[PDB]
Design a protein around this ligand. Sequence first.
Ligand SMILES: *[C@@H]1O[C@H](CO)[C@@H](O)[C@H](O)[C@H]1NC(C)=O
Ligand SMILES: *[C@@H]1O[C@H](CO)[C@@H](O)[C@H](O)[C@H]1NC(C)=O
Ligand SMILES: *[C@@H]1O[C@H](CO)[C@@H](O)[C@H](O)[C@H]1NC(C)=O
Ligand SMILES: *[C@@H]1O[C@H](CO)[C@@H](O)[C@H](O)[C@H]1NC(C)=O
Ligand SMILES: *[C@@H]1O[C@H](CO)[C@@H](O)[C@H](O)[C@H]1NC(C)=O
Ligand SMILES: *[C@@H]1O[C@H](CO)[C@@H](O)[C@H](O)[C@H]1NC(C)=O
Lengths: 172, 172, 172, 319, 319, 319
Amino acid sequence: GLFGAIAGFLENGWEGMVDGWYGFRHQNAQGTGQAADYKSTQAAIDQITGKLNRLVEKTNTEFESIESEFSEIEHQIGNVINWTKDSITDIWTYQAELLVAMENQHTIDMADSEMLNLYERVRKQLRQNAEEDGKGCFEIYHACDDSCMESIRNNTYDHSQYREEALLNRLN
Amino acid sequence: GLFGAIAGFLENGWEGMVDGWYGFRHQNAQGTGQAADYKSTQAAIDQITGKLNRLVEKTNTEFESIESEFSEIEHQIGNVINWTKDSITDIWTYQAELLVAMENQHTIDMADSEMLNLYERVRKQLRQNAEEDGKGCFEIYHACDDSCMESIRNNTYDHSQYREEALLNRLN
Amino acid sequence: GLFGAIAGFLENGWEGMVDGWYGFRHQNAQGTGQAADYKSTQAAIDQITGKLNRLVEKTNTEFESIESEFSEIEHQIGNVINWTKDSITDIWTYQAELLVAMENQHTIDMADSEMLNLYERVRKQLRQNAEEDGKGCFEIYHACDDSCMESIRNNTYDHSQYREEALLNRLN
Amino acid sequence: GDKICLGHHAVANGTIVKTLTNEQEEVTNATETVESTGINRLCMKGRKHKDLGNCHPIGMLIGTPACDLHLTGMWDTLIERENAIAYCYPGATVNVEALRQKIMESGGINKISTGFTYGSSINSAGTTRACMRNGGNSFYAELKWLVSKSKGQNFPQTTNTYRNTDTAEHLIMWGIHHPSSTQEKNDLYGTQSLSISVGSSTYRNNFVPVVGARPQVNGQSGRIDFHWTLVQPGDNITFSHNGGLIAPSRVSKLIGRGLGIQSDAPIDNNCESKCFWRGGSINTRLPFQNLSPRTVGQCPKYVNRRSLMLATGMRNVPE
Amino acid sequence: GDKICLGHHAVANGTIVKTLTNEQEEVTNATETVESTGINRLCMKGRKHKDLGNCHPIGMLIGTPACDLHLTGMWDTLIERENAIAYCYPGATVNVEALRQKIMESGGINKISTGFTYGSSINSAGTTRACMRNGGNSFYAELKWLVSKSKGQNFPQTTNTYRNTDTAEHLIMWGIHHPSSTQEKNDLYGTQSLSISVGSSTYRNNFVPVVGARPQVNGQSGRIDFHWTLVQPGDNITFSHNGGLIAPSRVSKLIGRGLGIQSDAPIDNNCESKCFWRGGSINTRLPFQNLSPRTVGQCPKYVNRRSLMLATGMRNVPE
Amino acid sequence: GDKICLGHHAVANGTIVKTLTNEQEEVTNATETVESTGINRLCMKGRKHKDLGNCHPIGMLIGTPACDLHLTGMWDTLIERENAIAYCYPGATVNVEALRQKIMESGGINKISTGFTYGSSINSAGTTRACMRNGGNSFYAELKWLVSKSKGQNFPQTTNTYRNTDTAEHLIMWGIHHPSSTQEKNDLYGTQSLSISVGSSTYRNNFVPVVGARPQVNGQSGRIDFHWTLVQPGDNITFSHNGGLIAPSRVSKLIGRGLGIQSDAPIDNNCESKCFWRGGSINTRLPFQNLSPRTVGQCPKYVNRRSLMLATGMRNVPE
Ligand SMILES: *[C@@H]1O[C@H](CO)[C@@H](O)[C@H](O)[C@H]1NC(C)=O
Ligand SMILES: *[C@@H]1O[C@H](CO)[C@@H](O)[C@H](O)[C@H]1NC(C)=O
Ligand SMILES: *[C@@H]1O[C@H](CO)[C@@H](O)[C@H](O)[C@H]1NC(C)=O
Ligand SMILES: *[C@@H]1O[C@H](CO)[C@@H](O)[C@H](O)[C@H]1NC(C)=O
Ligand SMILES: *[C@@H]1O[C@H](CO)[C@@H](O)[C@H](O)[C@H]1NC(C)=O
Ligand SMILES: *[C@@H]1O[C@H](CO)[C@@H](O)[C@H](O)[C@H]1NC(C)=O
């Protein structure tokens, strides 16, 4: 979208991923696996939580009545009161509508950015030992064991260890 | 700007491009051409349209008068009415001013993002068969026919087909 | 953060950098240096300044009193006046709070974007003669003299001049 | 030597707009959010409407000549004009503004007949040259000017009561005559001290005619001040008087709801609108307007600015 | 032949929300910001409260039978009901609404005794079948109906003064009787023209009983209209009257501050709340509500919408 | 072995701010948007101003001793004080608040002379020890206390009319005397029943002096209540009275527009300001303030918060 990833170069989400918002799918020698990235997930939830905390929780000033529900009130004053309440309601409803529209735009777009941020993390960590599919995948030109996959997702992968090996498959 | 592209690493827009907001210029064997990307264009217009739809179209509450235009009104009540209308106008004008300032910032920046998103799409699709000029151009190290150009702009370009060839000019 | 750089792939700021908001650290043959990028710095400050200009500087309508401070005022009218002022204050305080929250989010994130934009500038200008550390550093695979460093930070660096040389250390 | 380049469009003459950070960004296109042009006419298409011209809404209830054509009817907007006449014979109405509002938010009135009778000793047909008719001296059509039939005689202590037999609240107006001289008072009513007492189950008040020298208007130096209330269904309202009461021959029933417009703008039955003001009518899709702080109907919110441009394009970087 | 892929989660049934650019984005989850359900009861837990039932707040000060249980006390919320009775004997209070507000924002009243004495020539114990008690004819508990002890005798020109010896402002109510006949007026008071004059250092006003025929309510055709002020500490208020005054046997002292609720909703001592309205009580953390424009206490702001969903998730892209 | 690194600056002590997502972000610098400090003085530089001290704005029109220095003049701001005196002789003004507002928004008054004459049978120079002057007993400078020249005599039925020959509307004040005793009434005016009738083309009303016992203030137990209207250009206003009227020797003409301040803060001719309140003056560029809900002039909008920091720097990430 704004950050090109979610609903962008990734053409869909993964209904199977139930452990977190963001995650990895791998294919290798020992077969296929899936796993969620807890850290990026929590970056995104925490910000949502910050929004909710702002939304909820507001000290309100105390208001006493000015219109009697059961008495009759004088007509002119009643009309002025009505004008003022209606006017104030138009303001609040406009406000509430903008709040939600702008929050929602931002919320969607930050969710996109966290997804990108993770993608960019992995790309950098691979340096030259892999290249970019164009659809969220990194094609790994070396034997990346289940343990090696885990090292990527654990952000402990050492590109230097597989570098010259990987730089081979490069050209054939 | 915020996404670095429009008024960023691209140093100007193209007055000649009248078929869309975003597009490609190519140079090759058969010479020069220009063409607009309809898909990214429409991503950007649709969002602008969404903004206009929100702006226009609001149910209004009905207001009746509280100040007589032709009569004289009592002085104190008139002053209280005046205070209230003035106060409400200050709020609406402030609101209107913020609305436009924040929308305009967002509109400009989303336009920048869609431009980046497209650039990023093309970069990814080329993988190793081209490298980055730094000014919105991708220098293609292989014979990219008018048809081949069209395959890029049609997002049907197969990097594998020209890969090893392109990986040559690389080093000379 | 939103643009992944400040408080993202860069794990901290540089208390030593007092000449600007953004800047370079280099290591080379002749040793170490530090320097600020005046252009990106000024992009960011100018935008902050724009915010402050908007914040300050507002024509105000003139208000006369409607409540007497020293007299007693009639109870019902006083209560209607009180309701209206309280109501208006709730709107302004809500507004002030949203203004600051949204401006602050945007200010922080634009600061993150200008940092990225500069990082991206340098990456592009190096093309193939350097690769990405993952933490804001570019590992230069050629002899980059103090003067050569200065050419990067002056955005006058010619990648073609060191290209084939740099493409060597690449594979060993 | 083969390459592809990415670019964005641009235009020769950009539009300037404000953002959070920059007071003057040139963009490719923008559009106005504040409506500054309105229609110099009252757009009445699709409305059963009533132009009172020189008849004033209050004049409808008491029956001023100017209002002869407007004593009854039904409508969904009412148009008052700056001219307008309520009082042929000079005077004032207590709580005027509440009353015209009530009327101006009504969309229709019916007149129900009080049935009051007076008969001997009492002349129920006083008139005045300030309320001329066809032509000749006349009076407020919905009221009777009561005066001692003879002479300079004491006016009879009298009692009339209006019984609301309807299902809805009626609105009762009446007048108290305040003469210019002790002589005048004595001619029309007795030498007796005068008192009018009015009482329902909800209302009760009383009034005393009061003599005083006053500038001549139009006309006369006397005054007739009017007074009103609402009589609930199945309730009665009783007048005890010994002279000075301008009694009601008919009471009014306000019917629905309706929109009240005050403007001297000409009617135009060929445009619709939902938003009006003194200068006329406002038709716009925009949320904001600059024409007036005082509007009625469904209106864009008023703001204190000529222009607020909304960007509908990217940053414009020409060359 | 080895690769790693990045992805985001998704769900089978997304929620739809608005953004600046798109009126219908499907996201993974969202949450309501506008409260549309309230509690159909008055949540009084944690509150020293008072349900007046059919006693009307004004009735507390003058002492209508309905209010016998509510002539004194202390509280932090006060609950008025649609039923409620203030006037056993028909009448009205000048500046009613200001007064009940005052009362409804009080959280307690004490009654201080005026000490007024009248003695011979004057009957200080008039009663009426409109204010029945246990059972029998009776009267407003905090006032005395004063009438000529005998006959159709002239009522004595009388003077009573209340001295505020307290440190706080007292609230003084009194009534003026307006009879239905000249005969009635004469029976109770003299043939003398009647006048009641009331004066403090800050207040001064005067009233005249006024005869008129009026619909019978309940009951009676007479009326007793009430009037009030605040007498400052160390100040005195003096009544000069020659008949017609319904004098105070006690004055009221409004004590603290308190929250006034008008609702017919049943009390529930087992929920807390801070926000109330006619239909009951509102308990929500959300900043906005849809139930009513007229609320009291600490309330979510009212808006004109059933729903405003806030996204709490990403764009939902299924398949 | 060669490398270049990119970085951002940081500081040792960051400032904390709120964002949409995080209630406590540390940034490099921020700045306050809510003004919480004001000036404990009235900043009158650049203003033709008037400090009434203990003169009350109403006292300007009727001419209380306290206001002797303030009967006329021109200004663009007016300063009222908590002290202030309007009534040397005890009383009240009907529609006070409307009136002082009118005055407090004026920026100047002129006094035009009524030209009223009374002559034989009538003493136009009543005084009182409550309105002392240089020193001695005296009176309101713009009014005449009219009393039976002799005795306990019937005061002559009198007629005075003020003719507005100016191009602008004048403001006419007058008083009605309400004595403490029947005796007092009889001494000053007749035994005749008293009546004051006032009439213009737009105004008409009437008043009756009314006897009552009342607490002594200052002073005396009598009262003089004041009343006012605006007489349009080329119109006349006529007083018909037989005793009780405190007539106008001069009428007032309110001139321009001006700013009305109510504060006990000391004047300071060496600061400018555009925004004032009870506690003094407010000078700030910030759009919001915390000092008071009640301000006058061009002010920052009031908010319910001590502080609202606006980030002017990036996220601060130290080490
Ligand atoms: C004021 O508001 C309510 C509905 O909100 C209605 O009962 C009342 O009659 C309105 N008053 C007028 C005078 O238009
Ligand atoms: C109220 O406002 C209008 C114009 O803004 C003005 O003509 C009128 O005299 C004002 N009245 C007061 C009392 O401020
Ligand atoms: C209005 O508010 C002020 C202070 O905020 C208070 O002192 C005064 O009593 C209030 N008046 C009414 C009628 O509620
Ligand atoms: C009103 O009038 C009729 C006779 O005029 C009477 O029978 C009826 O009951 C009265 N109703 C009320 C409420 O006074
Ligand atoms: C009030 O009354 C008492 C006794 O009647 C007296 O001592 C005192 O002077 C009076 N105070 C005032 C302010 O009138
Ligand atoms: C007022 O009196 C003068 C004569 O004194 C007269 O010419 C003028 O027209 C009168 N105006 C009114 C309104 O009575």
